[PDB]
Amino acid sequence: SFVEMVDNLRGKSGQGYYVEMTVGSPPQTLNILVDTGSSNFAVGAAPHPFLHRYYQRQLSSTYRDLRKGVYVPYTQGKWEGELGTDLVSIPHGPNVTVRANIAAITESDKFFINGSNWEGILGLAYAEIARPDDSLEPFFDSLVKQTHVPNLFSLQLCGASVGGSMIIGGIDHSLYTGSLWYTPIRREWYYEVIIVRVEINGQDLKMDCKEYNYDKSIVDSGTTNLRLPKKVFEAAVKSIKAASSTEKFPDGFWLGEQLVCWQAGTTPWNIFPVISLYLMGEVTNQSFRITILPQQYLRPVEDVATSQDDCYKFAISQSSTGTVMGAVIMEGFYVVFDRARKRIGFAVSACHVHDEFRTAAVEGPFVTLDMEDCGYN
Numbered sequence: 001s002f003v004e005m006v007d008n009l010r011g012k013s014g015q016g017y018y019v020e021m022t023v024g025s026p027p028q029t030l031n032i033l034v035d036t037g038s039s040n041f042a043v044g045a046a047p048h049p050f051l052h053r054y055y056q057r058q059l060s061s062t063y064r065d066l067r068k069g070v071y072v073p074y075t076q077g078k079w080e081g082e083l084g085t086d087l088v089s090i091p092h093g094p095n096v097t098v099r100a101n102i103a104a105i106t107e108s109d110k111f112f113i114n115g116s117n118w119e120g121i122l123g124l125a126y127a128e129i130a131r132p133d134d135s136l137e138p139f140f141d142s143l144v145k146q147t148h149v150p151n152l153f154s155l156q157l158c159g160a161s162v163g164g165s166m167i168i169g170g171i172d173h174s175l176y177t178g179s180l181w182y183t184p185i186r187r188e189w190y191y192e193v194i195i196v197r198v199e200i201n202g203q204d205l206k207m208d209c210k211e212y213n214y215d216k217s218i219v220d221s222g223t224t225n226l227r228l229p230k231k232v233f234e235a236a237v238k239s240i241k242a243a244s245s246t247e248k249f250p251d252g253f254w255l256g257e258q259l260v261c262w263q264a265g266t267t268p269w270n271i272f273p274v275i276s277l278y279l280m281g282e283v284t285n286q287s288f289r290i291t292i293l294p295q296q297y298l299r300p301v302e303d304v305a306t307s308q309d310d311c312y313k314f315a316i317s318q319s320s321t322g323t324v325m326g327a328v329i330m331e332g333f334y335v336v337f338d339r340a341r342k343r344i345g346f347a348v349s350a351c352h353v354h355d356e357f358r359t360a361a362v363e364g365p366f367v368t369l370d371m372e373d374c375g376y377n
């Protein structure tokens with residue numbers, strides 16, 4: 001019965017992927033951002049300029065106040081509110097209702113996005129990073145404990161205005177091609193993984209693999225860009241700059257500020273390199289790689305002037321809190337969050353990014369010695 005969840009995600013480019021949910025009795029419908037980079041389920045619960053609707057606790061006969069405050073600071077944006085519980089369902093999801101923790105957002109700062117069409121956020125990571133502390137059980141833990149939904153979910157994030165699928169409880173084989181390749185979840189807090197090698201156009205960056213995971217590497221559907229530690233970011237940009245030097249870009253382009261444009265249909269994709277990320281595998285000295293096309297890390301953006309040229313934003317930014325494999329990395333892959341077996345699977349998505357001569361890929365096996373040494377401690 002996973003067909004009922006195919007195409008249950010929508011969104012606008014760069015404004016996150018969201019799924020429809022209901023909270024309370026009678027059910028109040030809200031669009032909820034799908035975020036594997038945090039662990040709090042929170043919804044707008046007070047008027048806000050960018051909110052078209054919000055959770056009205058007074059109108060829910062099943063609402064229970066927990067008499068406890070909460071706030072969450074993200075990398076960008078934050079909110080505060082009041083903790084409580086209520087009945088929650090996913091219309092295009094499993095046919096179940098669960099009582100879950102809900103943070104009623106009463107105040108926020110640079111969190112909600114004008115015209116995003118979502119009113120809350122579903123943190124799908126583990127209790128260890130929940131606010132105010134790990135005793136506040138995350139939504140997915142409650143779903144698994146209260147129903148028979150198996151302890152895993154899979155995400156198919158599709159590019160172009162955007163759509164995708166969140167399969168709750170399993171793997172839908174109609175959403176991918178080829179083989180699934182699995183990397184261990186290093187520790188159950190974020191979805192933490194270990195990157196063991198990085199290549200750009202087949203050239204090894206030749207860095208200490210610890211640099212790739214300093215101070216951690218996570219799979220984060222709630223972050224748009226690929227975010228890289230300072231030293232790795234500098235090496236990647238230098239390599240990407242050289243490969244595309246036949247064209248000039250403003251320096252602000254490489255910072256994610258300015259947007260580059262070309263005549264409609266003349267974007268020179270061939271001058272931008274592919275990025276291969278090698279992930280620790282399931283067996284001794286074995287890794288696998290996922291290859292990222294430039295159509296993934298050059299996010300298309302609405303032409304500020306006369307919409308007559310294809311314009312893009314550089315979707316790779318610098319990080320001071322480790323590597324983030326964000327939405328642009330996940331797009332075109334089918335990513336399986338196999339919580340039950342502490343692993344994350346990758347396969348080419350059925351909605352894969354199309355280049356003419358190159359293709360996004362998930363390939364293995366590879367031999368990589370000393371993979372354990374790549375984890376930061």
Ligand SMILES: CC(C)c1cccc(CNC[C@@H](O)[C@@H]2Cc3cccc(c3)OCCCCCC(=O)N(C)[C@@H](C)C(=O)N2)c1
Nearest residue numbers: 014015016037038073074075076077129220222223224225
């Ligand atoms: C909460 C704790 C556990 C924590 C602290 C710091 C970092 C993390 C890692 N995970 C971050 C995500 O949880 C967050 C979600 C989030 C917050 C606000 C808006 C969101 C998603 O959608 C809008 C779509 C556009 C996304 C733009 C974008 O890339 N962002 C807004 C990044 C910068 C980010 O901050 N996204 C987790």
